[PDB]
């Protein structure tokens, strides 16, 4: 039998978007040294070891 | 230099462990070739110079 109505459901529109960027970054070749960070509140006294990994 | 000080050392920051950082270490012990000094030797002297170590 011919169907005059079928369950097409809701009309929903979907939108896809794309965002592109290109960046050029300069990094410094830092020495690996040990710095003292004093205790502060809940932060305990600790040693810090530095790097050049940006 | 390879493994660093204990965390409670006063000198902790002076040697960041190369086992952690992978940084370069200077070596200071070098091969040395000896021969006798006969300037003050009495009697029969051995005057053979050096071995040709090259």
Please describe what this structure looks like.
With 54 residues, the first copy, chain A, is mostly beta strands. Chain A has no helices and 2 strands. In chain A, a hairpin with an 8-residue loop joins strand 1 and strand 2. Chain A is elongated. The interface between A and B is small, with 7 and 8 residues. It is classed as virus/dna. The entry lists the keywords Capsid, Virion, Parvovirus, Densovirus, Invertebrate, Insect, Pathogen, ssDNA, virus, VIRUS-DNA complex. Zophobas morio black wasting virus strain NJ2-molitor virion structure.
Topology:
The structure is cut from a larger assembly and holds 2 copies of chain A (54 residues).
Chain A: E1 34-37, E2 46-49
Antiparallel strand pairs in A: 1-2
């Amino acid at each position: 039998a011919t169907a005059i109505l079928r369950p097409i459901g809701l009309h929903v529109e979907k939108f896809q978007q794309t965002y592109r960027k290109k960046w050029r970054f300069l990094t410094s070749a830092n020495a690996n040294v040990i710095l003292a960070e004093a205790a502060s509140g809940e932060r305990p006294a600790r040693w810090a070891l530095t790097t050049g990994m940006a | 230099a390879m493994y660093g000080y204990d965390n409670d050392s006063a000198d902790f920051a002076k040697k960041p462990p190369a086992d952690a950082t992978g940084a370069e270490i200077y070596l200071q012990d070098y091969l040395t070739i000896y021969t006798n000094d006969a300037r003050a030797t009495t009697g029969t002297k051995i005057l053979a110079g050096f071995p040709p170590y090259k």
